[PDB]
């Protein structure tokens, strides 16, 4: 958990303009959060980037988890291996609002973070899930009480987030 170059937004939320994969390789955190879907199919976005950095080990483990346990619920999570990136990966499903899933579930999704003292995480429900990323940071700030280090891989978005937060 040797995080460097973060900006502290609140007592427990830090942010950096960085690729979460690169942060995980440098820091080897106890927990890295994946922005997952309910079948843990890591096709693109943050999920595809984390799985590629494990050379598909995350996807083979995820497929075995789903065959044995079934899919997650939207707003839910599971803990699996972090492989080479972290001790553990917390796979968290935020709502895909472009598919009609309720934006209320984004609070439930961020509540999963409170089971871990320190986390390296992305913005949930941003990207293909369709939520406004600044709204996602507001729900993170209002919901997460443990120590969260957010990596946002887009300098334009990072500057909008920092400016909106102050």
Ligand X SMILES: CC(C)[C@H](Nc1ncnc2[nH]ccc12)c1cnn(C)c1
Give yes or no for a contact between 96 and 90, defined as CB atoms under 8 angstroms apart: no
Site for ligand X in 63-82 (CB under 6 A): none
Helix locations, 16-154, DSSP H: 20-27, 45-53, 57-69, 105-111, 133-143
133 makes contact with ligand X (CB under 6 A) = yes
Quick one: CA dihedral 29, 123, 74, 43, positive or negative? negative
Region binding ligand X by CB under 6 A among candidate stretches 8-16, 42-50, 63-71, 72-80: 42-50
Q: Which of 6, 12, 45, 65 binds ligand X (CB under 6 A)?
A: 45
Distance, CA of 3 to CA of 48 (rounded, Å): 23
Query: Please, which residue, 71 or 130, has the CB nearer to ligand X?
Result: 130
Q: Which of 1, 3, 12, 19 binds ligand X (CB under 6 A)?
A: 19
Q: Which of 66, 118, 134, 157 binds ligand X (CB under 6 A)?
A: 157
Closest C-alpha among 57, 58, 56, 52 to residue 22: 52
Query: Please, which residue, 24 or 78, has the CB nearer to ligand X?
Result: 24
Region binding ligand X by CB under 6 A among candidate stretches 62-70, 80-88, 106-114, 120-128: 120-128
Distance, CA of 2 to CA of 26 (rounded, Å): 8
Tokens of 16: 């950096």
> Which chain residues interact with ligand X by CB under 6 A?
19-21, 35, 45-46, 49, 122-123, 126-127, 129, 133, 151-154, 157
């Amino acid at each position: 958990n040797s995080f460097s170059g973060y900006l502290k937004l609140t007592d427990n939320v830090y942010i950096k303009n960085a690729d979460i994969v690169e942060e995980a390789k440098k820091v080897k955190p106890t927990v890295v959060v994946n922005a997952a879907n309910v079948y843990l199919k890591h096709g693109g976005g943050v999920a595809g980037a984390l799985n590629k950095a494990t050379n598909n080990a995350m996807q083979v483990e995820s497929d075995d988890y789903i065959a044995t346990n079934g899919p997650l619920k939207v707003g839910g999570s599971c803990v699996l291996s972090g492989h080479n990136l972290a001790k553990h990966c917390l796979h968290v499903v935020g709502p895909n609002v472009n598919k009609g899933e309720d934006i209320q579930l984004l609070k439930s999704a961020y509540e999963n973070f409170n089971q871990h003292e320190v986390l390296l995480a992305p913005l949930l429900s941003a990207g293909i899930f369709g939520a406004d990323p600044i709204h996602s940071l507001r729900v993170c700030v209002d919901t997460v009480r443990t120590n969260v280090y957010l990596a946002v891989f887009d300098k334009n978005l990072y500057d909008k987030l920092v400016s909106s937060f102050l």
